[PDB]
Amino acid sequence: MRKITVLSFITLDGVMQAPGGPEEDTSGGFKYGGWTAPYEDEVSGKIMEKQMKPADYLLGRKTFEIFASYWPEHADFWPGINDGTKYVMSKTVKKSDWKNSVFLESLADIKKLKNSEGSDIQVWGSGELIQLLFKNDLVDELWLKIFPVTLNTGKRLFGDGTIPAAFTLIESSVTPSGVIIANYKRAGEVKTGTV
Amino acid sequence: MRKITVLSFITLDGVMQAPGGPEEDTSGGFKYGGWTAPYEDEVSGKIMEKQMKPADYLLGRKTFEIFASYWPEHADFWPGINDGTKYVMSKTVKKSDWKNSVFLESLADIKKLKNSEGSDIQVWGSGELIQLLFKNDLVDELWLKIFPVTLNTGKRLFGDGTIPAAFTLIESSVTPSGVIIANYKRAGEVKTGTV
Ligand SMILES: NC(=O)c1ccc[n+]([C@@H]2O[C@H](COP(=O)([O-])OP(=O)(O)OC[C@H]3O[C@@H](n4cnc5c(N)ncnc54)[C@H](OP(=O)(O)O)[C@@H]3O)[C@@H](O)[C@H]2O)c1
Numbered sequence A, B: 001m002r003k004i005t006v007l008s009f010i011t012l013d014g015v016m017q018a019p020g021g022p023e024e025d026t027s028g029g030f031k032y033g034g035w036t037a038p039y040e041d042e043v044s045g046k047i048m049e050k051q052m053k054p055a056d057y058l059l060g061r062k063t064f065e066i067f068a069s070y071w072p073e074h075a076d077f078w079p080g081i082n083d084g085t086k087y088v089m090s091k092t093v094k095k096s097d098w099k100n101s102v103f104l105e106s107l108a109d110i111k112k113l114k115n116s117e118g119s120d121i122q123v124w125g126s127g128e129l130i131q132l133l134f135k136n137d138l139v140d141e142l143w144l145k146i147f148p149v150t151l152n153t154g155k156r157l158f159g160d161g162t163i164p165a166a167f168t169l170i171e172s173s174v175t176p177s178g179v180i181i182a183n184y185k186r187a188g189e190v191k192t193g194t195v
């Protein structure tokens, strides 16, 4: 069994659509593409230069295609995304000219990939796919960056597929710009009591 | 002009409902009341102590009635809520047995209270009222406790009133139990660039 970590940038109110630029995702007429931009410093760059080390990858087709239009030309900056296998969930795509790209189609195939032998899997973007992974408790770890911003609309990290579940805060950090780094571990079932 | 702070206990996915006990709020058949119970410790107690200093209060009727059923009999632990004036939004309750209870019926009333002179206003619970506050940008600070848990359903802090807006992280820390204390300051507009 391989470990699956979901890495995500989110607003205070859990929005994750289009962090990196105004046209990254125009779904719904979303007007705040790029909201992650004003909050980038150099300690953040180091923090997730460590989070960008070589692994394998699991992606929704849309996030795969966003990545495939950029990163094949910037392997200097992120060699992990280019050298590691990228398993992509899609029914409409079967091949890519980006090397080390395998296309899966089912929950069953994701289960086989997790069972199979190989390096730990990273998930980036992939909100819809993440809903599928959450609903089947396939997500072993969460690396979140929470930014000091609220947006009403936009795709959400905790959406349709969220289940009730408990986590452990492995570690945390703060950013000179006001971003909270929070890395959680899956910890079984939700406990209730009385205060 | 008084400082309206909103204080709130939220899950990773931002559920606000019924933090303290299994029957605290059973709207929707919510089965996870008391989700903050396993996560309370000494450090949380001290941070609350600073947050429970004598202030004025602004509540939704429901949260006021939950508070009234318990807090007038425990003025030793939380004096401020008994001594301070409680401004309660309702069209249903015009008077209460609780000392220092004033009942407001409209948005204008909340603004006039804000325009007024007095102790700074604290807001606890009151998710629906909070929605009204957000929609008109009347909230100036946010003191959140984020808990390492996820629940699907439930009343959310950021809901049908959340508006796009920027914040400044004015403080943050972590409890040994794994909760993240994040206090934020309202900071003008949302900025987008290109990473
Ligand atoms: N905040 C961040 O960390 C971050 C980082 C990067 C990107 N993003 C954003 O992430 C978003 C990615 O777009 P998206 O989440 O809407 O789509 P996505 O998950 O990246 O990919 C959606 C596609 O993946 C396939 N798929 C996903 N789930 C499936 C399922 N449960 N069953 C069968 N097929 C499934 C389908 O492919 P087919 O149609 O081909 O069959 C589906 O159309 C964008 O908004 C992007 O800006 C966020």
Ligand SMILES: NC(=O)c1ccc[n+]([C@@H]2O[C@H](COP(=O)([O-])OP(=O)(O)OC[C@H]3O[C@@H](n4cnc5c(N)ncnc54)[C@H](OP(=O)(O)O)[C@@H]3O)[C@@H](O)[C@H]2O)c1
Pocket: B007, B008, B009, B010, B015, B016, B017, B018, B019, B024, B025, B059, B060, B061, B062, B063, B064, B089, B090, B091, B092, B093, B105, B124, B125, B126, B127, B128, B129, B130, B132, B155
């Ligand atoms: N996470 C935390 O920190 C925390 C702490 C304590 C409690 N809570 C939870 O907060 C929740 C409080 O219940 P709630 O959020 O449903 O309601 P609420 O905001 O506490 O009060 C509901 C009542 O307030 C009045 N009201 C609120 N907004 C109004 C508006 N825009 N216009 C006119 N009147 C308005 C109305 O009174 P009338 O109907 O009387 O006219 C409404 O019925 C509970 O679930 C509680 O468990 C959370």
